Amino acid sequence: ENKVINFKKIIDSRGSLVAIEENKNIPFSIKRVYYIFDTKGEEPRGFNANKKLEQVLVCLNGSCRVILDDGNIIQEITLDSPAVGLYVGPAVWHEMHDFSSDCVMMVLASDYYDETDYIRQYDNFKKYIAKINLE
Amino acid sequence: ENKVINFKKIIDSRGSLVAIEENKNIPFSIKRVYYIFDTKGEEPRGFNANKKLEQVLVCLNGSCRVILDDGNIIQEITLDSPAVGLYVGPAVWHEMHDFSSDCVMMVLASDYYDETDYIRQYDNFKKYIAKINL
Ligand SMILES: Cc1cn([C@H]2C[C@H](O)[C@@H](COP(=O)(O)OP(=O)(O)O)O2)c(=O)[nH]c1=O
Ligand SMILES: Cc1cn([C@H]2C[C@H](O)[C@@H](COP(=O)(O)OP(=O)(O)O)O2)c(=O)[nH]c1=O
């Protein structure tokens, strides 16, 4: 609704195609594009949040289960269609679970990588939130 | 000229990661990302060149065989690895073939989709270049 993104997909005799255009079908400017592949193992990914960064998650192949928490509510959504993007805003905790063996997960980011934008501790994250409420 | 870009790739028990950053590891600013999937049939694609667009192609899954003509040299390249990107500069002809079934192909473009920037006559492409040569 506010988080789930339905990208317009095109289909022909040849296949499918999806195009994402910076600040057209995504609320921000693209500066970085990262992706995860050749996954394996039972240990998740993510479990962190970001102060400034805005992102959009997309399961290009296979599937992945992702959790969300803006401190308030928690949401879960299983990405399994390249045509769907998930919006992860700043100040939103995230987790990437259950990567299918063939999963390819892509992320469109508003800025370059920067370890100091991270909130990797749940409590601080929570903390971070409350503080915020006050202001 | 080689047009291949090899991205640094992180590795751990979890899998692999590759990160592409506008103007950092790719000679241009990203304005659009598009990908092709659920491909079928025996028809290739591409077959055009762009006068202003700068792209980078990445085969995120499976594989695909690419042909790039810069007007000086033709290069055929099989992409079967997400950590390799091919740079398709302006006035560079390209074609995608041999898409595996599970093939997922991705393109990073320096600009929005503009049909008018597209040359779809190889011959014309060849001419445009010559002209360019002056
Ligand atoms: C997402 C991302 C990660 N990285 C680096 C940070 C780490 O050195 C590594 C893995 O990222 P991440 O999964 O966040 O690391 P960690 O194992 O601590 O959870 O990749 C970049 O360099 N650029 C990026 O865009
Ligand atoms: C690559 C791309 C395609 N499309 C559309 C154009 C077409 O209607 C469809 C796929 O077409 P395309 O791959 O460009 O080739 P062709 O015109 O020969 O069919 O997707 C966009 O809207 N934006 C893009 O960035």
The total tally of domains of chain A equals 1
Q: What ligands are attached or bound here? A: thymidine-5'-diphosphate
What share of the residues of chain A lie within helices?
A: under 10%
CATH superfamily of chain A: Jelly Rolls
Order of helices and strands of chain A: EEEEEEEEEEEEH
Number of strands of chain A: 12
CATH architectural group of chain A: Sandwich
CATH class of chain A: Mainly Beta
Helix/strand/pairing category of chain A: mainly beta
- In terms of quaternary structure, the protein is homodimer
Shape of chain A: globular
Q: Ends of chain A: how far apart? A: 26 Å
Q: Radius of gyration of chain A over alpha carbons?
A: 15 Å
Q: Strand arrangement, largest sheet of chain A?
A: 1-9-6-11-4
Largest sheet features of chain A: 5 strands, antiparallel
CATH topology of chain A: Jelly Rolls
Q: What fraction of the residues of chain A are assigned to beta strands by DSSP?
A: over 45%
Greatest interface by residues involved: A-B, 36 and 35 residues
Number of helices of chain A: 1
Protein name (chain A): TDP-4-oxo-6-deoxy-alpha-D-glucose-3,4-oxoisomerase
Organism (chain A): Aneurinibacillus thermoaerophilus
Active site (chain A): 48
Enzyme class (chain A): isomerase
Entry keywords:
homodimer; 135 residues; mainly beta; Jelly Rolls; 5-stranded antiparallel β-sheet; binds thymidine-5'-diphosphate; isomerase; deoxysugar biosynthesis; ketoisomerase; dimeric; DTDP-6-deoxy-3,4-keto-hexulose isomerase
